[PDB]
XYZ file of C-alpha atoms in Angstrom:
330
model
C -129.953 0.995 220.085
C -131.170 3.958 222.111
C -132.560 4.684 225.550
C -134.634 7.510 226.990
C -135.449 8.086 230.661
C -137.106 10.859 232.607
C -135.089 12.537 235.350
C -136.942 14.147 238.268
C -135.834 16.722 240.867
C -135.572 15.257 244.361
C -137.033 18.364 246.013
C -138.516 21.798 245.335
C -135.056 23.361 244.901
C -133.687 20.971 242.262
C -130.935 19.949 244.693
C -130.381 16.844 242.553
C -132.189 14.731 239.966
C -133.058 11.026 240.099
C -133.555 8.667 237.167
C -135.014 5.147 237.458
C -132.589 2.343 236.574
C -133.409 -1.362 236.258
C -130.798 -3.702 237.788
C -130.816 -7.489 237.733
C -133.259 -10.241 236.832
C -136.078 -9.853 237.667
C -135.539 -6.103 237.501
C -134.913 -4.159 240.696
C -135.650 -0.491 240.016
C -133.493 2.020 241.899
C -133.533 5.800 241.523
C -129.988 6.902 240.749
C -128.284 10.287 240.524
C -126.762 10.456 237.026
C -123.395 12.149 237.567
C -121.291 13.374 234.632
C -118.629 14.299 237.224
C -117.835 10.741 238.366
C -117.456 7.268 236.925
C -118.806 4.712 239.424
C -122.252 3.116 239.302
C -122.884 2.359 242.973
C -126.025 1.443 244.887
C -127.454 1.048 248.334
C -127.716 -2.703 248.780
C -128.482 -5.627 251.059
C -124.802 -5.320 252.070
C -125.024 -1.702 253.245
C -124.520 -1.317 257.008
C -128.063 -1.351 258.352
C -127.729 1.817 260.447
C -126.653 3.713 257.304
C -129.842 2.896 255.355
C -132.807 5.223 256.020
C -135.538 4.831 253.409
C -133.491 4.104 250.281
C -134.415 1.277 247.956
C -131.714 -1.400 248.015
C -130.272 -3.737 245.410
C -130.188 -7.347 246.629
C -127.812 -9.286 244.357
C -128.822 -12.656 245.840
C -132.298 -12.122 244.333
C -130.914 -11.481 240.821
C -130.326 -14.568 238.690
C -127.887 -12.596 236.497
C -125.780 -11.133 239.329
C -122.237 -12.419 239.703
C -119.699 -11.389 242.326
C -116.708 -9.719 240.688
C -114.259 -11.663 242.791
C -111.709 -9.608 244.699
C -112.974 -6.253 243.453
C -113.526 -3.366 245.849
C -114.298 0.309 245.395
C -114.077 3.473 247.462
C -114.983 6.990 246.372
C -114.833 10.435 247.951
C -116.673 13.305 246.303
C -115.549 16.911 246.388
C -118.288 17.798 248.877
C -116.732 15.402 251.394
C -119.275 12.603 251.021
C -118.087 9.045 250.427
C -119.037 5.404 249.976
C -117.290 2.067 249.478
C -117.948 -1.638 249.070
C -117.627 -4.642 246.747
C -118.710 -5.278 243.160
C -121.131 -7.427 241.187
C -121.719 -7.605 237.468
C -125.354 -7.601 236.404
C -127.754 -6.468 233.706
C -128.552 -2.756 233.884
C -131.157 -0.965 231.795
C -131.864 2.759 231.471
C -134.913 3.891 229.573
C -135.005 0.722 227.471
C -131.234 0.538 226.785
C -129.666 -2.606 228.253
C -126.050 -3.378 229.167
C -125.144 -6.894 230.248
C -122.147 -7.394 232.497
C -122.235 -3.877 233.952
C -120.200 -3.367 237.118
C -122.688 -2.592 239.899
C -120.780 -1.366 242.937
C -122.579 -2.487 246.084
C -122.132 -0.165 249.067
C -121.053 -1.631 252.354
C -120.572 1.859 253.836
C -121.966 5.275 252.940
C -121.357 8.614 254.614
C -124.005 10.481 256.573
C -125.164 12.749 253.747
C -126.093 9.700 251.672
C -127.960 8.069 254.568
C -129.811 11.323 255.223
C -131.073 11.582 251.635
C -133.791 8.961 251.341
C -134.519 9.860 247.694
C -131.157 8.839 246.166
C -130.537 5.081 245.920
C -127.060 5.457 244.400
C -125.105 7.140 241.620
C -124.625 6.345 237.931
C -121.352 7.878 236.804
C -121.072 9.318 233.295
C -117.576 10.854 233.354
C -114.695 8.999 231.682
C -113.928 5.468 232.835
C -110.373 6.489 233.779
C -111.911 7.878 237.018
C -113.604 4.609 238.000
C -112.446 3.544 241.475
C -112.785 -0.261 241.248
C -109.603 -2.079 242.255
C -107.648 -4.056 241.177
C -109.426 -4.057 237.782
C -110.923 -0.704 236.817
C -114.442 -0.933 235.404
C -116.284 0.858 232.601
C -119.206 3.229 232.955
C -122.666 2.357 231.694
C -122.171 4.756 228.768
C -118.752 3.299 227.929
C -120.238 -0.224 227.876
C -123.269 0.838 225.806
C -121.430 3.101 223.362
C -120.629 0.681 220.553
C -124.247 -0.530 220.421
C -125.771 2.948 220.346
C -127.042 4.440 217.105
C -124.672 7.372 217.788
C -122.026 7.441 220.572
C -123.702 10.216 222.572
C -125.931 10.945 225.511
C -127.863 14.125 226.228
C -128.907 15.888 229.411
C -132.074 17.987 229.368
C -132.614 18.956 233.006
C -135.757 20.817 234.011
C -136.138 23.880 236.202
C -138.456 22.821 239.031
C -139.735 20.119 236.657
C -138.759 16.737 235.199
C -136.389 16.419 232.265
C -134.760 13.734 230.134
C -131.571 11.728 229.669
C -131.301 10.221 226.178
C -128.698 7.709 225.028
C -127.734 7.150 221.406
C -129.656 9.945 219.656
C -130.211 13.693 219.629
C -133.881 14.706 219.970
C -134.083 17.614 217.541
C -137.459 18.648 219.032
C -135.933 19.231 222.479
C -134.038 22.464 221.792
C -134.313 25.731 219.885
C -131.851 27.063 217.356
C -128.666 25.101 216.729
C -126.306 23.117 218.953
C -122.878 24.714 219.399
C -120.116 22.167 219.925
C -116.950 22.902 221.880
C -113.729 21.037 222.586
C -113.283 18.721 225.574
C -110.157 17.744 227.484
C -110.325 14.287 229.058
C -106.963 14.704 230.818
C -108.594 14.901 234.278
C -111.312 12.350 233.462
C -114.076 14.985 233.264
C -116.153 16.581 230.506
C -113.839 19.585 230.765
C -114.321 22.517 228.384
C -113.643 26.259 228.116
C -116.460 28.786 228.186
C -115.808 31.960 226.188
C -117.119 34.408 228.792
C -120.119 35.730 230.662
C -122.615 38.521 231.174
C -124.651 39.600 234.200
C -128.269 40.531 233.512
C -128.535 42.903 230.562
C -124.877 43.885 230.905
C -122.246 43.617 228.238
C -120.580 40.292 227.550
C -117.073 39.853 228.971
C -114.869 37.726 226.718
C -112.691 35.564 228.949
C -111.757 31.886 228.948
C -113.294 29.902 231.813
C -112.145 26.283 232.029
C -114.606 24.058 233.844
C -116.484 20.772 233.915
C -120.010 19.893 232.825
C -121.204 18.125 235.993
C -124.805 16.971 236.352
C -123.968 15.668 239.845
C -123.207 19.135 241.256
C -126.174 21.350 242.137
C -124.705 24.822 241.693
C -122.580 26.870 239.290
C -119.058 27.407 240.665
C -116.978 30.066 238.898
C -113.926 32.253 239.599
C -114.297 34.702 242.463
C -114.032 37.697 240.114
C -117.009 36.502 238.031
C -119.088 35.611 241.086
C -118.421 38.978 242.742
C -119.487 40.767 239.550
C -122.771 38.823 239.586
C -123.683 39.375 243.244
C -122.695 43.048 243.144
C -125.871 43.513 241.066
C -128.089 42.205 243.909
C -128.782 44.713 246.692
C -127.754 43.302 250.040
C -125.980 40.218 248.690
C -122.806 39.235 250.486
C -120.452 36.333 250.972
C -121.048 34.717 254.348
C -118.270 32.609 255.832
C -120.675 31.176 258.422
C -123.234 30.047 255.834
C -120.580 28.971 253.329
C -121.142 31.214 250.328
C -123.044 34.105 248.862
C -126.432 34.843 250.380
C -128.954 37.446 249.328
C -132.219 38.933 250.615
C -135.085 36.606 249.794
C -137.016 39.734 248.715
C -134.613 40.276 245.791
C -135.303 39.815 242.107
C -132.183 38.096 240.734
C -130.590 39.037 237.399
C -129.906 36.439 234.760
C -126.419 35.082 234.072
C -125.162 34.332 230.569
C -122.263 32.026 229.707
C -120.534 31.672 226.352
C -120.173 28.497 224.315
C -118.032 29.506 221.384
C -119.875 32.409 219.778
C -123.197 31.182 221.237
C -124.757 32.238 224.535
C -126.731 30.313 227.181
C -128.920 32.463 229.454
C -129.619 31.245 232.989
C -132.761 33.044 234.234
C -132.457 34.762 237.588
C -134.972 32.426 239.208
C -132.663 29.464 238.540
C -130.103 31.095 240.880
C -132.420 31.123 243.934
C -131.810 28.229 246.355
C -134.162 29.505 249.003
C -133.866 30.296 252.700
C -130.600 29.306 254.355
C -132.682 27.730 257.151
C -136.427 27.294 257.461
C -138.158 30.656 257.819
C -135.062 32.771 257.190
C -135.210 35.842 254.959
C -131.618 35.200 253.863
C -131.514 33.065 250.709
C -128.669 30.948 249.333
C -127.214 31.812 245.938
C -126.919 29.399 243.047
C -123.707 30.946 241.695
C -120.780 30.451 244.079
C -117.016 30.837 244.014
C -114.858 27.935 242.890
C -111.883 29.289 244.847
C -110.593 26.403 246.917
C -112.253 23.768 244.718
C -109.447 23.799 242.149
C -111.761 23.693 239.119
C -114.793 25.570 237.874
C -118.015 23.548 237.806
C -120.912 24.024 235.380
C -123.379 22.195 237.602
C -127.142 21.864 237.348
C -127.841 25.616 237.630
C -126.011 26.101 234.322
C -126.844 22.817 232.587
C -130.600 23.048 233.206
C -130.665 26.229 231.088
C -129.469 24.208 228.072
C -129.869 21.053 226.049
C -126.456 19.431 226.516
C -124.841 16.839 224.238
C -122.126 14.622 225.706
C -120.484 13.418 222.495
C -118.417 10.299 223.156
C -116.929 9.977 219.690
C -113.247 9.068 219.387
C -112.475 12.721 220.102
C -115.162 13.714 222.638
C -116.896 17.088 222.458
C -119.719 18.888 224.249
C -122.718 20.563 222.610
C -124.992 23.239 224.066
C -128.294 24.545 222.717
C -130.878 26.896 224.153
C -134.301 25.395 224.797
């Protein structure tokens, strides 16, 4: 089997992407944030504290003839950005782009933190990291990909995120029309539960490539590109007036600037992030200070190839017995 679904930016900055997901019988369609950095499929629901729901579409398990309470199971997750959610668990039928999993754990939120409430466009998350990170207790549950894998034509999914435009998540096949050149594959460590890999270096604008190993995660659920402070300083030094602002929380730059590109290495191959992809707009409405899309990972504990990087590539998440990651230009 295969599936194919369009993923759409939630706003004009590409702060996140939402993908429609069918849950239950009859189908209830929720728009979920596909997150290769986590491993829980959780939704706003009829059980979510009423004051914490503000415009999201909810899953109502009592209206699904295929929903079953997973008795005794609870879940609770905290993301690196400080947001969180928790609740209980149902199993139900879940379909993405025509690919169906029966018996998928659907984690129903009883509580969500303020950032989730405040984002009316995201109805929940669909985790695509390794199932070892799943938070369900006392019986850990499998991700949608992990459940679908054996049925797929090939044990892979691909992320093709758009810049200020829709893109595609495919399951079970590689669309050879969706990229240019060849796909370069690189090794993955699953030891921390992430799609963790080592970039071979970087360049700023038209500058020379610096060969250096950068260990990080391919994370569709993180907006920005977080890299070591040395790399980030070298980038922003090429933008007149750019500076790190403790009060804003990262590098800012004059909105009048033209940003240079940023290149990262995948083996001997190179992925070029255009300068425009690094502009996250005014820090507050009407400001002439703009927020940068490349930020320091110091204090995070890991480097993060988030959407800013991934949207410049066609990315293969290869879930073969030994997982790997593939990157192509597009």
